[PDB]
Every structure is written in C-alpha cells, then in structure tokens.
Design a protein around this ligand. Structure first.
Ligand SMILES: O=C(O)COc1c(C(=O)O)sc(-c2cccc(NC3CCN(S(=O)(=O)Cc4ccccc4)CC3)c2)c1Br
Length: 297
C-alpha cells in the first residue's frame, strides 16, 4: 500500500535503489523500424525510441515512422500517445498523427528552450493572424484563442485536413514550469494542471488517445501518465489500496521505454497520487485548494 510504502522508502534512502529496480525489470522489446537509416533524422535522441509493437504508424505509404508509442492501459481503460518534442522536419508528421489518431488534446510538459537547448520545434502558431500550413502532410493549424496562467497556458486550436476540408478543435495544455529532469513545484500545482486536462474532456474514451510530450517523451511525460493512470485505477475501484504504482509503471513501460527518468520523479508520482486520492475518495474541497496553492493567477 502506497502510503506506508512511501514512508518506508523515505525512511531508508532507497529511492535510487527502488527506481533502479524498475530499469532492471523494464520490458526490452525491439525498436527495429526506429533504428532504420532513413529514420535517423526523425529521432531527437539516439537512445530513446518507440518499440515496433506499440509505435504509432502514420497513414502514408512513403514513410510511416514517427517517434511515438501507444500506451494502452487495458485494466484502466485509458490510452495515451507519448511522443518526443517534434523536430523541424516532423511537425507535419506530428499533426498527421494527431489527426489520424483522432486526438482531441495535446499536453506539453516542456518549454521550447530549456537550459540553453532547443528541446522542441515551434509546432503550433503563436498568433491568430499567422496560421501554420504543413505542406508535407497537408494540414492547416490556426490559433483560435488562449488562456494564459502563471505556470501553464491552454490554447484552443483548429486543425484542418486540407485534403477533405474537415475541421477539428484541438486543446493544447502547456505546462511551462516543470523543469527538465525535475519535478513540479508541488503535488498541488501538478494535480491542478492534470484536472484541467481531465475537465476539458480530452481524456474521454469518445476521443482518440490524448497526445502527451515533453522533450524525449518519457521523463516528464511518463510521470504525468503514471499519475493519471493510478488515480483512474483507484477511481474505478474506489479503493486506493488496490493500486500498486510500481506494477502499473512497469505495465506502462511495456509500451514505451524509460517512462520516468529520475528517482525523484517517481517519488513525486507517489506524492501526486496519494494527494489526488483525496478527491477520488469524496473530498470535494481539495480541487479548489490545489487551485489556490498552484497560484495560477
Ligand atoms: O523530461 C524529462 O524529465 C527529461 O527529459 C529528457 C531529456 C530532456 O528534456 O533533455 S533528454 C532525456 C534522455 C535522453 C537520452 C537517454 C535518456 N535516458 C535513458 C536511460 C535508460 N533508458 S531505459 O529505457 O531505462 C533503457 C532500457 C530499455 C528497455 C528495457 C530496459 C532498459 C533509456 C533512456 C534520457 C530525457 Br528522459
């Protein structure tokens, strides 16, 4: 049980040891397609690739590769697409995937520039007057509106399939203060953001899977998804004792390597889930508390 286990690991200092065990046991499947010579310029990191069995395939005969995996949580009944931050040459691919997979929401847990590095291309329009057109995949993207908060921004976008003139609204959730290789300021600010994603309907089973990305699509993205899945499992059974975080984390790693980069990110997962359980189990006031504590205004 997660709260006694958390106090146990903390009391010792075995978060490094605990975290390492996950790396030692994680699933190791082939990533043949991602390692093909022609896809070298489609991967941001040499050591972070999608497994062939769970990779998202683009619907085009030319090259159907994109560095993204489909994390399908059977028991929880919720899917995500975890992908790397789009490269200058893969933004078209990125939006093709969003469209083909019927995604309604896109979560961005990083900033374009972190520690002096360009962690992600500017794949979305920053001003309504200047929409973006991806000639390679034939899609248009327009900024419709945005709600800027102290540490995250929510953008309303419109994606048009230029070929069929079809249109869809895409909600963009940009967490701007989650440090790379780090953890959120507090469980409150994290959960406030997550619930913002939840309340938008983007995680609904009536849409395609939500697309989640930071830079490599495994560290911060993994932390976010693990916390969401754990709270969902718990929710489905209304029994926080039946949720084994490490077990579910392992299960997520069958669909994409390296989910959760650091021992502290894992420690924070526990933290976030433990706090989120309050809401899951009936506490109707915590939500607002999180909003206050997050200082979004
Ligand atoms: O968002 C963040 O918090 C940080 O984001 C980032 C980055 C960023 O924002 O700059 S770079 C990065 C990164 C890049 C290359 C390799 C590894 N790390 C390796 C470690 C070992 N693993 S693994 O998956 O544990 C290896 C393995 C594969 C299958 C089975 C067992 C082990 C692969 C990635 C990490 C991560 Br994540």
């Amino acid at each position: 049980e997660m709260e006694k286990e958390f106090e146990q690991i903390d009391k010792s200092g075995s978060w490094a040891a605990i975290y390492q065990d996950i790396r030692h046991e994680a699933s190791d499947f082939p990533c043949r397609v991602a390692k093909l010579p022609k896809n070298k310029n489609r991967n941001r990191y040499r050591d972070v690739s999608p497994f062939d069995h769970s990779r998202i395939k683009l619907h085009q005969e030319d090259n159907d590769y994109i560095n993204a995996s489909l994390i399908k949580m059977e028991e929880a009944q919720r899917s995500y697409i975890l992908t790397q931050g789009p490269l200058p040459n893969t933004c078209g691919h990125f939006w093709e995937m969003v469209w083909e997979q019927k995604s309604r929401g896109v979560v961005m847990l990083n900033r374009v520039m972190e520690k002096g590095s360009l962690k992600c291309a500017q794949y979305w329009p920053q001003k309504e007057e200047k929409e973006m057109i991806f000639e390679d995949t034939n899609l248009k993207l327009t900024l419709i509106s945005e709600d800027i908060k102290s540490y995250y921004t929510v953008r309303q976008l419109e994606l048009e399939n230029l070929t069929t003139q079809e249109t869809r609204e895409i909600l963009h959730f940009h967490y701007t203060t989650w440090p790379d290789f780090g953890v959120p300021e507090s469980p409150a600010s994290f959960l406030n953001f997550l619930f913002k994603v939840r309340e938008s309907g983007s995680l609904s089973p009536e849409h395609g899977p939500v697309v989640v990305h930071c830079s490599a699509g495994i560290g911060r993205s993994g932390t976010f998804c693990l916390a969401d899945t754990c709270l969902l499992l718990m929710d489905k059974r209304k029994d926080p004792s039946s949720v084994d975080i490490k077990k579910v984390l392992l299960e997520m790693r069958k669909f994409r390597m390296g989910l959760i980069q650091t021992a502290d990110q894992l420690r924070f997962s526990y933290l976030a889930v433990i706090e989120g359980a309050k809401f899951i189990m009936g506490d109707s006031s915590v939500q607002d508390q999180w909003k206050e504590l997050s200082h979004e205004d």
